[PDB]
Amino acid sequence: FEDLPNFGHIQVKVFNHGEHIHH
């Protein structure tokens, strides 16, 4: 995240992990 939240786009994958394919 430096202007463009590329780290915030990386956390979208973390939300999808904890939703569907949560281990």
Side-chain angles (χ1 to χ4, degrees):
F1 186 11
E2 184 177 63
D3 192 62
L4 193 288
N6 194 64
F7 187 68
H9 298 163
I10 247 65
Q11 292 301 115
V12 180
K13 288 71 169 293
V14 180
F15 302 149
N16 294 341
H17 183 82
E19 181 178 62
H20 195 288
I21 56 163
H22 58 283
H23 303 304

